[model samples]
Target: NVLTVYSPYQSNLIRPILNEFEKQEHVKIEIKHGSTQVLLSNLHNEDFSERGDVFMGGVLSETIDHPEDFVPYQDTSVTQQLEDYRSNNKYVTSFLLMPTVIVVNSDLQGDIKIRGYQDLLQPILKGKIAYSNPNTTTTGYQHMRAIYSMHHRVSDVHQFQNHAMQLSKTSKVIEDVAKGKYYAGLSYEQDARTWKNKGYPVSIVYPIEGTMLNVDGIALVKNAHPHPKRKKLVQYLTSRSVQQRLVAEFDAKSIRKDVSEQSDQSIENLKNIPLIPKSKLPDIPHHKFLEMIQ
Candidate 1:
């Protein structure tokens, strides 16, 4: 009768799968919701008394990258089904690919051109952009990484810190960009889509330096107090059946090539999917993530 504690970025995304599991298995799932940092803090703050059975949110690096926080399941069959970029170890598994965006308000400047990462440096865009708080959002950190990586693309990381700082800290990186308060914003493709669907004149720009697709994953914590149902839950979540169900259920694209999107015009399809190795993104010192705004 051991219960499972699962942490998800948004309940809206995890509920359907959880409910289905509960209905079929007759197990009660205790869901804890919050930002990734909150949960990470909880892992220590709670003194591991209520240690999680599985951590379902945040980019993989926060938990999986460390290895010490979670147990490795590389010996499991689930590893065979995932991309090499995702399941290098058994403990961590990537379930979704999120595309980043540089959304701009068309109403603010119809002719304003932005094609790639370098374009963001134009004098016209120096102060007219915003980004989310990196400390609070995983994608925010990736955006910061993208900027620093772009600096390396030009082979001169020292030339542009001040302007990069400004854009990273701009207020209203999302709502303002959508409402025309700012010229542009660096956020997720989904965020831009949600706002644009509401009649905002924002347009998403897939950075020419090649956009990045962030692989969001899940992991079982080490020494997770084993409930009779815990292993079954993990097995189910990684099984092909649940993976198929999770596609529409969580609005996540399947890592399997055989799985198809529920809709042809689905949110997962239209972006310039970046295939980055998840291991390479951990704690890059140059990644000043969100400090530019703070």
Candidate 2:
């Protein structure tokens, strides 16, 4: 029997392990990749037979929205190393965090200022700012969360110029910023760093305020195909062996602290940007916040 999966994570992050998994286990793997929302909606609407054995990709914020759909078994192999906040009796297991940073093209704009979320609305940036749709991406979800995190402290949306001016679906937030289709974009810092190294006219703007951190993860579905083989597949995916390989070769930051310490990461992995202190904003669970966005 073979185990099948659905993942929206980049192929660069999964292909090597996929090749090795086939060779080592002599098993077959079928994967369908798409945005979490699309797959989740499909899973919600479709019959059990169409669903995949594993739902392994994207930020936790969106995946956990429909927790009832996944199997909640804990894998002890890497449990001790993960941060307490990341581990849940819930459906998904933590994989890594993609730190989203604000990126800008320094050469085009002549040392423009961008210190906070409000900076995205600047008159200087009229029609020159872009971000993914808040509905499609958990990265976008975190961006909205970041805004809600700091909305009151920051002001002037018109000066902020919040519009559908550059709302798009592609993950190339850094590309538009570098090409000046947008003067700025919000995206993963590591990805933003890729273009910077290529000698694009881009500058990485690590937000002075805290960045929106997206935790990517993996899980088994409630009624996925080949139930017996699927259980073994989930166990294998979460094993210490695969976790280490994902980190070392694919630049995945292990969610487990011990693994992070052994690999290269930090309590201050990058510079610390402050999240809104609890006293500053009313605290509510993620679903309540999600409804408002809906």
Candidate 3:
């Protein structure tokens, strides 16, 4: 039997990994790709219809207000795999740790030292820094949270945010920075690794204050027509072996604490601060999100 999966992630990144899972389970998977917001918007438009068995992308933050749409599957192994990361929502099983970091144009960075959020304000940076629009994306909101926690006050950020380049998507932050349109862009560790591998003149800096590590989860949909293999899909994604492979081949950091910490790719050795705990974050409205950016 086949299980349908909905994701906004790139095909190449997801296709091969699931190919292995499909081979292992001897089950076929239908992966449908789209942008995150539209996928959710369409799901809501369809009256939260459960045609898809699993939804995988990044943030589980959006599921907070729409819990009825997803089925909760908790695994003690997931908690054992991730220590402090265990505080996550049970409705979604996280697959990746999305760390918020800065991507700078290495050629443009010159002698300027950008160790943390404080350095983005250096008068010498010379151009507006790039950031995703907070009103629209989950990564955008997390970027603000990380910056807010590091700077400790609103006005301090305004020092350079007065004209920050507010892009519509996370990739734009990395693209524009690589193109030198902006001196730097707030981006995730995954994208930083991606562009770097492509030979872009970029450097990733985990904020010295502490990096913000966010969870990327995959969940089973509560469907009208249940697929037996649906839960298996989530289980496979959260498994330690797959998590480690995700880190190795997919430019990702794993949710499995033991598996991730051993690899040179792991962030356990890095200084990290948690994001606003998922359960405590509000389902912030667009206007409120705008205010947070301003």
Candidate 4:
């Protein structure tokens, strides 16, 4: 009647969906929420991985590092857009498509042109920007990938690294920027849309160079007490209905090909900026990338 799940999602962000599943399935879902970095860190512990019934967070690049910790959930049936993410790995299932964006204080951005990642390099903006550490947070890891692809040159990375403040978390990056503590920060589209609508002096910019599109995902823990409900949880999360709810409610993109995103400027109405194709993007490990940039 109950399933223990580990996730990085804010309980509020997915509670409605989960509650719906609860009533429909007649089961209670006990979710243990934590940052993806910490949860993935603990996954390295064999004893730890054996305790949870499901791991409902961490993108594929991060989770793919620990395959033995996740058992293959072969019930992947996502639309064509997510087919590669579904079939490329056996243990983790593609959940959502998250596009990273730049959040800036509208007032603070005065006189600073921010059309692309390179614009953040403006001398006046040094130390005025912030983001989480690439080696520790999921957002940071994706940010690292996006910028690194745009500026793979060693000198370019070195210059970008020198000025960007390595904040402890993504929330702080958003908070500090929205409140005008910093000029700009790397964040997801959801946060940018959220804070702006809340009347904060914030603005969202999709880089002209491109944005990194990440596949946040879910998986089943191996060596754990198996629950029949656990597999179904993954199946439910990846279904078309849930993806629609997420897009409508959360401003996130759906991985399903058949599902249309919200009828807003985020998807259909905006200028077509580059979204680094997931498969074509570099697969550099976060830690290795962090070290190289340093």
Candidate 5:
């Protein structure tokens, strides 16, 4: 049997486990890769590619926004570990949840020390920080969400004006900061850790006001002919074995509760920031945050 997947997750991070699934199930897996927004837009298009059996690694909000495009799968207990993150078998389940952080360039340090999100607003750091574009990247969208979450409760939001150099992709933010083009960047812990482990002069900072947590979700495409392999593949990926691999190899936080400490994930090291309840997560198209930033 064959299963086609549309995923935005990095191939290197997912291919190893997906290959293992292929070998064990005797099923071929075909993947088409793009940004989360691009894939969702394609799925919603009239001429969408109905070839996709599964959609993987989109932000949870994107999937929730287009519920009509996915078929419900009632059986997901194969990975009971991630029950808390699942959408009650309605549409999507999160495979991994990563914490947002500030990636700082050590070599560019000035008198102003950035210990939290507010520190990024220092006049000295204006136009020297890189952030992904919110209209496209989920990372960028989370950055905006985090800002808004605090903006209303804290000081003025105008302080962040011109505070960051907006880039089109998350990779650009990481690279720009690592290469000293920007003093720091807003990115996920996984990306920041990857660059730091590669000997970049990068440092991770979990903000004092806490950080946003982003979920990478998986869902099935609507009305597409179901492959018998589809259920098995979803089960396999979310299984304890593969979830363990994701944490060990990709610097990710597994949603699976059973695999507690597969890697040296420093959960104790970061603040346990509370996520905004889903009901208050600011509607996608009608959000005031995105409009304020633009």
Candidate 6:
């Protein structure tokens, strides 16, 4: 039997474990990849029954908004262990986690403090920061919500609005910052580190005020009759051993409580940094955030 997975994650992140699953289970796995928005758009366009068997790497916040597109899988092996991270234990299960950080181009700016989200609002940083369009990109939406939540906490909305420039994609924000096109931007820690490793002068800062803990979720699409192979694949992915593989190989932090810390950069070590709870995440109406930033 073969199982189809639609994912937005980098191929390198999932292929090794998937290959192992195929070898162990004696079933073929086919992956369809695209950006989060792209995949969500495609999924929303197709009838639920006609979509791929599993949707992997979809953003949990975004996926939760469209429950009709996915069938709930309550029987995943890790359900009890990951209860806090799951929404309803039915629609989506978070497999990997990424922390959002402020990426700075040290080559362009120095001799200044940028220890937290408030630092981006410094007068010197006005017009020098970039972020993704919240209306079009999932990262953009996350970034916007995190900033919004921070401002609400501090009761200072004007400062954040003064400094932020909306870009089309989060990758553009990261790439431009790496090239010294922008002083700083909101990006994933892995992305900033990858660019820095390539000698791009990028530095990652976990905001003392708060940061987003983004989850890459795996969901089973609505199928009238579920396939056994799909259930097996989901079980294998939620297993402890495979969860650790994601951390060891892909630099992902597992959301499951039972998964032991596998790296120095694990979320548990960042005690000073407050993680924005999913419930606190702002659900800004469509194109509403674009209006504020513009």
Among the numbered candidates, top TM-score falls to 4
Could you give me the TM-score of model 4 versus the true structure?
0.89
Q: For each candidate, how many residue pairs have backbone atoms clashing (under 3 Å)?
A: 5, 5, 1, 0, 0, 2
Top-down TM-score ranking = 4, 5, 3, 6, 2, 1
Give the local distance difference test score of model 1: 0.61
lDDT of 6 by residue, 1-294 (tens): 567788766566687789998899898888887657777777778775566788777465454456777776643565545566664436776676777788889988788788778888888889998887665566776676677776553234445655788777667888999999989998876666567767888888887777887776778877655557887787788778888777675556777777765544422343445788767765655455556654
lDDT of 3: 0.70
**TM-score of predicted structure 5:** 0.85
Over 194-281, each residue of candidate 2 has an lDDT whose tens digit, in order, gives 5666688776655656566666777778774545666566566666677677666545556665553232332225335454444544
- The C-alpha TM-scores of every prediction are 0.74, 0.80, 0.82, 0.89, 0.85, 0.81
Candidate closer to the true structure by lDDT (higher is better), 1 or 2:
2
RMSD to true structure for each model, in Å: 4.6, 3.7, 3.6, 2.5, 3.2, 3.6
Q: Give the per-residue lDDT of model 4 (tens digit) for 174-286.
A: 88999999999998776677777678988787777878766777778775567778777778887788888887877667767766667364332222657766554666665
Between candidates 3 and 5, the one scoring higher on lDDT is 5
Off by over 4 Å in 5: 46-49, 61-63, 82-84, 153-158, 262-294
TM-score for candidate 2: 0.80
List the candidate 2 regions with Cα displacement exceeding 4 Å: 61-63, 151-172, 193-201, 227-233, 260-287, 290-294
- Candidate 1, clashing residue pairs? 73-90, 73-91, 74-90, 116-208, 169-293
Q: Give the range of the ten consecutive residues with the poorest summed lDDT in model 1.
A: 152-161
What TM-score does model 6 achieve against the real structure?
Answer: 0.81
- Where is the poorest 10-residue window by lDDT in model 6? 263-272
TM-score between model 3 and native: 0.82
